[PDB]
Enzyme design. Sequence first.
Site, PDB file in Angstrom:
ATOM      1  N   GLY A   1      47.416  16.254  78.309  1.00 37.59           N
ATOM      2  CA  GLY A   1      48.075  15.433  77.276  1.00 37.59           C
ATOM      3  C   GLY A   1      47.161  15.216  76.086  1.00 37.59           C
ATOM      4  CG  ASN A   2      47.509  13.292  71.560  1.00 37.08           C
ATOM      5  OD1 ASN A   2      46.437  13.647  71.073  1.00 37.08           O
ATOM      6  ND2 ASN A   2      48.606  13.114  70.840  1.00 37.08           N
ATOM      7  CB  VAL A   3      44.363  10.841  76.632  1.00 39.44           C
ATOM      8  CG1 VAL A   3      43.182  10.454  77.513  1.00 39.44           C
ATOM      9  CG2 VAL A   3      44.787   9.655  75.774  1.00 39.44           C
TER      10      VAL A   3
ATOM     11  CE  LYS B   1      52.478  -3.290  77.001  1.00 35.84           C
ATOM     12  NZ  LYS B   1      51.361  -2.605  76.304  1.00 35.84           N
TER      13      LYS B   1
END
Lengths: 356, 359
Positions: free
Chosen positions: A175-177, A80
């Site tokens: 949310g978007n999901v 990451k």
Amino acid sequence: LEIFEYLEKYDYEQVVFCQDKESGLKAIIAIHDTTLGPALGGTRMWTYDSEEAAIEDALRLAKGMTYKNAAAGLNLGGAKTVIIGDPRKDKSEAMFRALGRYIQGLNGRYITAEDVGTTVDDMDIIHEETDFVTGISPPSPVTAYGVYRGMKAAAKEAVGTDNLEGKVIAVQGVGNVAYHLCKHLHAEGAKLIVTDINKEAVQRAVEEFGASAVEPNEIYGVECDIYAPCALGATVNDETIPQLKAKVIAGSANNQLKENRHGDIIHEMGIVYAPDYVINAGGVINVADELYGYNRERALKRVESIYDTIAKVIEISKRDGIATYVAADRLAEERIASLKNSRSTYLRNGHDIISR
Amino acid sequence: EIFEYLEKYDYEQVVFCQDKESGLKAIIAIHDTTLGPALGGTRMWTYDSEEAAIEDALRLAKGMTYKNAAAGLNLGGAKTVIIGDPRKDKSEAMFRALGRYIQGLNGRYITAEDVGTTVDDMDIIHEETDFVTGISPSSGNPSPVTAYGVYRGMKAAAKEAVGTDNLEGKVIAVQGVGNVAYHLCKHLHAEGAKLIVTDINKEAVQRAVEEFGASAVEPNEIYGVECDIYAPCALGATVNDETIPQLKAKVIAGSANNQLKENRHGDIIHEMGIVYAPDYVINAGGVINVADELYGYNRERALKRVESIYDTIAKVIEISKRDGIATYVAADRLAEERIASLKNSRSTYLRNGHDIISR
Ligand SMILES: NC(=O)c1ccc[n+]([C@@H]2O[C@H](COP(=O)([O-])OP(=O)(O)OC[C@H]3O[C@@H](n4cnc5c(N)ncnc54)[C@H](O)[C@@H]3O)[C@@H](O)[C@H]2O)c1
Ligand SMILES: NC(=O)c1ccc[n+]([C@@H]2O[C@H](COP(=O)([O-])OP(=O)(O)OC[C@H]3O[C@@H](n4cnc5c(N)ncnc54)[C@H](O)[C@@H]3O)[C@@H](O)[C@H]2O)c1
């Protein structure tokens, strides 16, 4: 911080500090493991308390990916990148052009993609300097479809059947999901109870797929047979677990468990937890298929597989009598180590995702 | 507060590398890659604390950037610090691991020997990567070259303070008769110079007295000796508030690193009329040699870039007057000017561009 001690503890490989002054870039590429192949992990760009916290985050999240990627059956290690900055203010072409070069400076050990505080346009600038980057050409609805499948296998243990008819689902967040999840869910004749801090977003959900709306800090004690956190993490703590009506937890949210302990007790309450990093894998599994060379069908079918990954994690949770997250931790580890042996044969013409 | 230090001197990368099976804990610091691949050795030492190991790494790398620049190499600055007791903690695995991490940088970093690393060390690293130099089984010396490097540096310094680049009749205080210092003496004696040598190994001294008809002094005394040139070839920070007023010579020129204990000691030496050949310009010889190893070793051409040290000092000497600043500051600027000059002159596009890696 005492870095090297932390690295030797969980046998991290590298922590790569990157700085370009003209852009002001301050980036930490943490690489935990590259056993299965190139470390895949997004670029997070957030404003941090202190440099110590930025390094901590980097390492945490990378060691994370190692397990997500392993369990999702990808041929990729854990990494990451954390940029220190205010995405709203501190971004430039130069910033991403610089980081791109540093990423090519690692020649396939690290592959990046978007995360918190990085656009596609961001990756598109990085793509100018390197191909060790993904999610540029045709991720939320896939993650969501990822859960849709994960939920079913979870339902089949605690419910007896992978059908969702008659089951109540508490969907925390639209949310978007979460939005895209709901569509898929209630079109199998299950019952949806939704909540959100944006109340207009909630109204769309109640109106479209006939849900009941609830105040944010009620969604736990709602009479419901499955719980789907798709907004906040650490949502499964001492205060919410006894409030919980559901016998199955399955959502998109990361770090659903507030401490390791909370998984152990949920196991003994009879509650079936689809572990976070196995379910939300959908999004990664997609950008991961981008590199082999995108195929919409085959991409989704590896996302569909989430069902079976949970089912196996569910099985091992009984066969060994341990919390579903521990089974998942071991499912990954066993895979990483199993291949480590089975692949230790020599070839001079070796194949990896980069040999596309 | 790493990033603050990095943004201060515009460092490029600090690469923390750890293999648990070997126990490797290495910091590859890369300050600049403007002129091309960063060249810098692997130091392996026992450190007070991890903080001090990171500090050392950065210090030394930022160092190399300037040494390599001034020595007229096409290489940037880096240094690898392994945290370990070279006597105890070394393994094949350790160097096999580090080698891979170095190939994991694909020509941004090139390593070599330093304090606490053998060639046999580099030879194991060579198994994993070619971004490594100083391989003897294959090839430099490399102490006598460093030493010849000083011989030339000393001459240009002598011609400034003393009037002629001849060293015949000059008395030279050679602090240390180490592997370098000895071979420096070899050149000096055989150009009709007179040596005052000192050393903690008294047998090493005896070799020098016997082979060059030299005088000897106790370690403590070499500063206040009546001599025309001072040549530190043992220890650094040897030019401090203690030794500068003791100093009889009008030229300092030796192989030692960090000859100046603090920046200010250079400033005052300038105004006393003492002519200081700056450390990292003079001892460049050794690097300039392993540097020529990569282009593909050539004894003649290698030495001729070492020979050039004369002119690098001469230019540093010139700028020390033309701008009225201590010789080390002129040297810092000589490097900077080169790095930046080429940065512009090379910013033309080629798809078939040439560097030391395309040998
Ligand atoms: N997008 C992906 O592929 C993916 C994969 C990994 C991570 N996630 C996880 O899923 C979520 C992101 O999904 P998204 O981008 O579609 O969501 P989002 O960030 O677009 O929306 C999250 C919603 O949570 C609501 N919310 C915040 N606090 C709340 C509270 N206390 N109670 C109720 N609702 C609250 C907000 O109002 C918002 O509408 C995060 O929890 C994230 O960690 C998603
Ligand atoms: N060898 C090279 O190519 C090269 C290039 C760069 C660095 N250096 C510099 O040269 C120095 C040594 O060069 P070398 O490797 O040829 O030497 P060496 O290590 O082979 O010998 C060092 C000598 O210094 C003497 N010495 C140590 N402390 C002393 C003291 N307090 N007083 C008097 N004598 C003392 C020792 O007796 C010993 O004989 C290093 O400290 C370093 O700064 C050498």
